[PDB]
Coordinates of C-alpha atoms (C1' of nucleotides) in Angstrom, one line a residue:
Chain A
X1 CA 4.4 48.8 -34.5
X2 CA 4.7 48.8 -31.4
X3 CA 8.0 47.8 -30.5
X4 CA 10.0 48.1 -27.5
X5 CA 11.6 51.0 -27.7
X6 CA 15.2 49.1 -26.7
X7 CA 14.4 46.8 -29.4
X8 CA 14.0 49.5 -32.1
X9 CA 17.2 50.9 -31.4
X10 CA 19.0 47.4 -31.0
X11 CA 17.9 47.0 -34.8
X12 CA 17.7 50.3 -35.9
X13 CA 21.2 51.3 -34.8
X14 CA 23.4 48.9 -32.5
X15 CA 23.6 46.4 -35.3
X16 CA 25.7 48.1 -37.7
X17 CA 27.6 49.5 -35.1
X18 CA 28.7 46.2 -34.0
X19 CA 28.9 45.3 -37.7
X20 CA 31.3 48.0 -38.0
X21 CA 33.2 47.3 -34.6
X22 CA 33.6 44.0 -35.6
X23 CA 33.2 43.6 -39.6
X24 CA 30.9 40.0 -39.5
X25 CA 31.3 37.9 -42.7
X26 CA 27.5 36.8 -41.8
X27 CA 24.5 38.9 -40.9
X28 CA 23.6 36.2 -38.8
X29 CA 26.7 36.4 -36.8
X30 CA 25.6 39.6 -35.2
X31 CA 25.2 39.4 -31.8
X32 CA 21.8 39.8 -29.7
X33 CA 20.1 39.1 -26.2
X34 CA 19.2 35.9 -25.9
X35 CA 17.9 36.3 -22.8
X36 CA 18.1 37.9 -19.0
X37 CA 17.6 35.8 -16.0
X38 CA 17.0 36.9 -12.6
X39 CA 17.7 34.6 -10.0
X40 CA 16.9 35.7 -6.6
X41 CA 18.7 33.2 -4.1
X42 CA 17.4 33.9 -0.9
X43 CA 19.1 30.3 1.2
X44 CA 17.4 31.8 3.6
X45 CA 14.4 30.3 3.6
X46 CA 15.6 26.6 4.0
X47 CA 15.1 27.7 7.5
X48 CA 11.8 29.3 7.1
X49 CA 10.2 29.2 3.2
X50 CA 8.3 32.3 4.7
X51 CA 10.6 34.6 3.0
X52 CA 10.5 33.0 -0.7
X53 CA 6.7 34.5 -1.0
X54 CA 8.5 37.5 -0.3
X55 CA 11.3 36.7 -3.0
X56 CA 8.2 35.5 -5.2
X57 CA 6.4 38.9 -5.0
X58 CA 9.3 41.2 -5.5
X59 CA 10.4 39.3 -8.5
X60 CA 6.8 39.5 -10.1
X61 CA 6.4 43.0 -9.6
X62 CA 9.7 43.8 -11.1
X63 CA 9.5 41.6 -14.1
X64 CA 6.7 40.4 -15.0
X65 CA 6.4 37.4 -14.0
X66 CA 5.7 34.9 -11.6
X67 CA 8.9 33.3 -10.8
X68 CA 10.2 29.7 -11.0
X69 CA 11.0 28.4 -7.1
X70 CA 13.7 26.1 -7.2
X71 CA 14.1 23.2 -5.1
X72 CA 17.3 22.6 -3.7
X73 CA 19.5 20.3 -6.2
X74 CA 21.3 18.6 -2.8
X75 CA 21.2 18.7 0.9
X76 CA 23.8 20.6 2.8
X77 CA 24.6 20.7 6.6
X78 CA 26.6 23.6 7.2
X79 CA 24.0 25.9 4.8
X80 CA 21.0 24.2 7.3
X81 CA 19.8 22.9 3.6
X82 CA 17.8 19.6 2.3
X83 CA 16.8 18.8 -0.6
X84 CA 13.8 19.7 -2.4
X85 CA 13.5 22.7 -0.1
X86 CA 12.7 26.0 -1.6
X87 CA 15.8 28.1 -2.2
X88 CA 15.6 30.7 -5.3
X89 CA 13.5 32.5 -7.5
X90 CA 14.1 32.7 -11.1
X91 CA 13.0 34.7 -13.7
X92 CA 13.8 33.8 -17.2
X93 CA 12.7 36.8 -19.5
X94 CA 12.6 36.8 -23.2
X95 CA 11.3 38.9 -26.1
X96 CA 9.5 42.0 -25.5
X97 CA 9.3 41.8 -21.8
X98 CA 13.0 41.0 -21.8
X99 CA 13.7 44.5 -24.0
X100 CA 11.3 46.8 -21.4
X101 CA 12.8 45.3 -18.6
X102 CA 16.1 46.0 -19.3
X103 CA 15.2 49.6 -20.9
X104 CA 13.3 49.8 -17.1
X105 CA 16.7 48.5 -15.2
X106 CA 19.2 50.9 -17.3
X107 CA 17.1 53.9 -17.2
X108 CA 15.5 53.7 -14.1
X109 CA 17.0 51.2 -11.8
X110 CA 20.7 51.3 -11.5
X111 CA 21.2 55.1 -11.4
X112 CA 18.0 54.9 -8.3
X113 CA 20.9 52.3 -6.4
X114 CA 22.8 54.5 -3.7
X115 CA 26.6 55.5 -5.1
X116 CA 25.9 53.7 -8.3
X117 CA 29.6 54.4 -9.6
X118 CA 29.4 52.4 -12.7
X119 CA 28.7 48.4 -12.9
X120 CA 32.1 46.4 -13.9
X121 CA 32.9 45.2 -18.0
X122 CA 34.5 42.6 -16.4
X123 CA 31.8 40.9 -15.3
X124 CA 31.4 38.4 -18.4
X125 CA 31.3 34.6 -18.5
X126 CA 33.6 34.4 -21.3
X127 CA 31.4 33.8 -24.0
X128 CA 30.0 37.5 -24.1
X129 CA 27.3 36.8 -20.9
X130 CA 27.0 39.2 -18.5
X131 CA 26.2 38.8 -14.9
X132 CA 26.1 41.2 -12.3
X133 CA 24.4 41.6 -8.7
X134 CA 22.0 43.8 -6.2
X135 CA 21.9 43.7 -2.7
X136 CA 18.4 45.0 -2.4
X137 CA 15.2 45.5 -4.2
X138 CA 13.8 49.2 -3.7
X139 CA 16.3 50.5 -7.3
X140 CA 12.5 49.1 -9.1
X141 CA 10.2 51.7 -8.8
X142 CA 7.6 48.8 -9.3
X143 CA 7.5 48.0 -5.4
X144 CA 6.1 49.9 -2.9
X145 CA 9.0 51.1 -0.5
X146 CA 6.9 51.2 2.1
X147 CA 6.2 47.2 2.0
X148 CA 9.9 46.1 1.8
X149 CA 10.9 45.4 5.1
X150 CA 13.2 42.7 4.1
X151 CA 15.8 43.8 1.5
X152 CA 16.5 41.0 -0.8
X153 CA 19.1 41.7 -3.7
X154 CA 19.0 39.4 -6.6
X155 CA 22.0 37.8 -9.6
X156 CA 20.9 39.8 -12.8
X157 CA 22.3 37.6 -16.0
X158 CA 22.2 39.1 -19.6
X159 CA 22.9 36.2 -22.1
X160 CA 23.9 37.1 -25.7
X161 CA 24.6 35.0 -29.0
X162 CA 28.0 37.2 -28.7
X163 CA 30.9 34.4 -28.8
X164 CA 33.5 36.6 -26.7
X165 CA 33.4 39.2 -23.7
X166 CA 34.4 41.7 -26.0
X167 CA 31.6 41.3 -28.7
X168 CA 29.4 41.4 -25.6
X169 CA 30.7 44.4 -23.7
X170 CA 30.2 46.4 -26.9
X171 CA 26.2 45.1 -27.2
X172 CA 25.9 46.3 -23.7
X173 CA 27.2 49.7 -23.5
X174 CA 25.6 49.9 -27.3
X175 CA 22.2 48.9 -25.1
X176 CA 23.0 52.1 -22.6
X177 CA 24.9 49.7 -19.3
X178 CA 26.9 52.0 -17.4
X179 CA 30.3 50.0 -18.1
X180 CA 33.2 52.3 -16.0
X181 CA 36.1 52.5 -17.5
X182 CA 38.2 49.8 -16.1
Chain B
rA1 C1' 6.5 -37.8 40.5
rG2 C1' 7.2 -37.9 35.5
rU3 C1' 10.5 -35.7 31.9
rU4 C1' 13.3 -31.9 29.1
rU5 C1' 17.6 -29.1 29.0
rA6 C1' 19.3 -28.8 20.4
rA7 C1' 23.2 -29.0 16.8
rC8 C1' 28.1 -27.7 13.9
rU9 C1' 32.1 -27.9 16.0
rG10 C1' 40.3 -29.6 13.4
rG11 C1' 38.0 -33.2 21.0
rG12 C1' 34.3 -31.1 24.1
rG13 C1' 33.0 -26.9 26.9
rC14 C1' 33.4 -21.4 26.6
rG15 C1' 32.7 -18.0 22.0
rG16 C1' 30.3 -17.9 17.7
rU17 C1' 27.0 -19.6 14.3
rU18 C1' 22.1 -21.6 12.6
rG19 C1' 17.3 -19.1 7.5
rC20 C1' 17.1 -15.3 3.3
rC21 C1' 20.0 -12.3 0.0
rU22 C1' 24.5 -10.2 -3.2
rC23 C1' 30.4 -10.7 -4.6
rC24 C1' 34.4 -13.7 -3.7
rU25 C1' 36.6 -18.3 -3.1
rA26 C1' 34.8 -21.2 -7.5
rA27 C1' 39.4 -23.7 -11.4
rA28 C1' 35.8 -18.5 -17.9
rA29 C1' 27.8 -23.5 -18.2
rU30 C1' 25.8 -24.9 -13.5
rG31 C1' 26.9 -26.4 -9.3
rU32 C1' 30.9 -26.9 -5.4
rA33 C1' 33.5 -27.1 1.0
rA34 C1' 35.5 -24.8 5.3
rC35 C1' 34.2 -21.9 12.6
rG36 C1' 37.1 -19.6 4.3
rG37 C1' 36.9 -14.1 3.4
rA38 C1' 33.6 -9.3 2.7
rG39 C1' 28.4 -6.8 3.3
rG40 C1' 23.1 -7.1 4.2
rC41 C1' 17.8 -8.9 5.7
rG42 C1' 13.4 -10.3 8.9
rC43 C1' 11.5 -3.3 4.9
rC44 C1' 10.2 0.6 2.5
rC45 C1' 6.4 2.7 -1.3
rA46 C1' -0.9 4.9 -2.4
rA47 C1' 3.4 6.7 -4.6
rA48 C1' 9.3 5.2 -5.2
rG49 C1' 2.9 0.9 -8.2
rG50 C1' 0.9 1.3 -13.4
rU51 C1' 0.8 4.3 -18.1
rU52 C1' 2.1 8.6 -21.9
rC53 C1' 4.8 12.8 -22.4
rC54 C1' 9.3 15.0 -22.0
rC55 C1' 14.7 15.7 -19.7
rU56 C1' 19.5 13.9 -19.3
rC57 C1' 23.7 14.2 -15.5
rA58 C1' 27.9 13.8 -11.6
rA59 C1' 32.3 16.4 -12.3
rC60 C1' 35.5 20.6 -13.7
rC61 C1' 35.8 25.7 -15.8
rU62 C1' 34.4 31.5 -16.3
rG63 C1' 31.0 34.7 -14.6
rG64 C1' 27.9 36.6 -10.8
rA65 C1' 25.1 40.2 -3.9
rC66 C1' 25.0 38.8 0.6
rG67 C1' 26.9 33.2 -0.7
rG68 C1' 31.8 31.0 2.0
rC69 C1' 35.0 24.6 -1.7
rA70 C1' 29.7 23.6 -1.9
rA71 C1' 22.6 26.5 -1.8
rU72 C1' 20.2 29.4 -6.5
rC73 C1' 21.3 31.9 -11.4
rA74 C1' 24.1 32.3 -16.6
rG75 C1' 27.3 29.7 -20.2
rG76 C1' 30.8 25.8 -21.4
rU77 C1' 33.4 21.7 -21.4
rG78 C1' 31.2 16.9 -19.9
rU79 C1' 28.6 9.6 -23.2
rU80 C1' 28.6 8.6 -18.2
rG81 C1' 32.4 8.2 -13.8
rA82 C1' 26.0 11.1 -11.4

RNA sequence: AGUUUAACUGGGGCGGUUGCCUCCUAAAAUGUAACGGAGGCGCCCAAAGGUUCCCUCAACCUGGACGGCAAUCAGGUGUUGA
């Protein structure tokens, strides 16, 4: 029909490749990309919550979704933080938007960041769910670079049905993630 | 000039206290004294009430850019210690 590039590639070849690398007794034990979450934790919004709107605009122009403004769970004296205030913009991404954002990320943004010597393959939680982070936003072409007054990084996590870092790493590298060899 | 100027009080005075709520004392019903042991109240909320629906934390582990023990994100453990 009109499936995303990455998704048709996934269910055409990557599933079989993962089966070969890990002979799974059941097809439903195959790893799959559940979701990707883009956090934009901005703790600098406590003193002034005017940076959160820029975080929102950035995440929207990146992913395609209005983010969820994560109110603080707790007040912290050191971080100048009360409860309930806007610290962080989260976007959950599932399905077609997820696959499209991953293709965009891989094929555009990661080679667009300065001095891209790869992403660490050790950055797995222990359940085949990856998480890396960025220090800025201009790596996404969707943003007008002239309109970037403040750098605003993020934490991108890719959570999968994999049950270990090995299968997760296989899946991500098959999708085409830049895992440097260390 | 007429009068008032409290009481409890291990004598009285000084000090402290005086009403309400919670615990212990209190002896497994209730209740139970002491200038016995500890605290709190003299409000707040127009939602912090009503109802319908939904959810389940804290803590810990692991991974994560600033981010640090601890901000927000992900996964897991977690039947309750929040």
